[PDB]
Amino acid sequence: DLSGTWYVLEGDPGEHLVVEALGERLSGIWTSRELAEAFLAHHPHLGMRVSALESRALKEAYLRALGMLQVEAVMVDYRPGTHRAQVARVKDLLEEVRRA
Amino acid sequence: LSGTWYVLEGDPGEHLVVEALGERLSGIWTSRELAEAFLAHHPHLGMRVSALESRALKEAYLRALGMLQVEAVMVDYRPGTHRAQVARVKDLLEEVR
Ligand SMILES: [Cl-]
């Protein structure tokens, strides 16, 4: 679930990690600091750090920012896994955050 | 960078580009081992490793990156390194020429 704090990657304020794969611009959201730091541990030298979006306002500002970055999807809890990746459309997340 | 280049390919022209630091970046590997190890840890991205042996295959690769506004590529990227190796696409481009 996406309720609860979202953990994302951020360099200088506002510069979030955007990756181009699957024919789109993707960012990432992790559902726990451990999962995000784990991913961070496997991707150094990108000037990134884990950032926590604890409030509705911060989660909201984050989505707006993904929009400014023209990102229409985010991978949820991405990691070297066995299950098909979880890709959420930003348009869908903008609806979800209204539950928070 | 004299030898064969190992790169990632997905949809045509689609390479793995990441926005970090101040610009757009991709990745190039000198070892098939490092490239395949990186790919193994990055599943679900529809990527595959392909080898660029020709000077003409390296050029076609860099020009696609150039048009995708990718100004630099990470050389032999992998976790547990002190610092990363970065090469301007413009440099590699002129070099290959
Ligand atoms: Cl860093």
UniProtKB/TrEMBL annotation, chain A:
Gene3D superfamilies in the record: Uncharacterised protein PF11572, DUF3234
Cross-referenced InterPro entries: DUF3234 (IPR021628)
Protein name in the entry: DUF3234 domain-containing protein
